[PDB]
Subunit: 51 residues, 3 copies
Amino acid sequence: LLELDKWASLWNWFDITNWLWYIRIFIIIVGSLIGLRIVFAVLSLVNRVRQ
Amino acid sequence: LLELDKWASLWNWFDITNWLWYIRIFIIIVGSLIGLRIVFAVLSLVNRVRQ
Amino acid sequence: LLELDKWASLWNWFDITNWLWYIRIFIIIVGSLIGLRIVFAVLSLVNRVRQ
């Protein structure tokens, strides 16, 4: 199944190996996303002044 | 210490092996949840009119 | 590349091994605050009563 020879074969495909080797970093960025949404709560007070 | 023989042993347990090769896809679905929240912003303008 | 000898080498570094073998559980916990954020939409009705 999983061996030195099995893993080294995906380096020739290049494109898929990059995606399966950067997903870990990607989840941390999707964490900061929810925190960004909270400021909209202040925009609701600005929405009451809208003509 | 992760070997060809150690990995192939979990295929006899069947049920728990699924948890080690499907959760990666499941994180992207928790990525659609945050996108859904924005419509709540327009609902706040419908909530003050609620007779 | 990934081998029995390559994995057993990070046990001498100790600190990095813990970071690469506990975050997987943490993604479920970073999935708890998203459900919590909704009450801020409810706080907008309490903000209209706040003199």
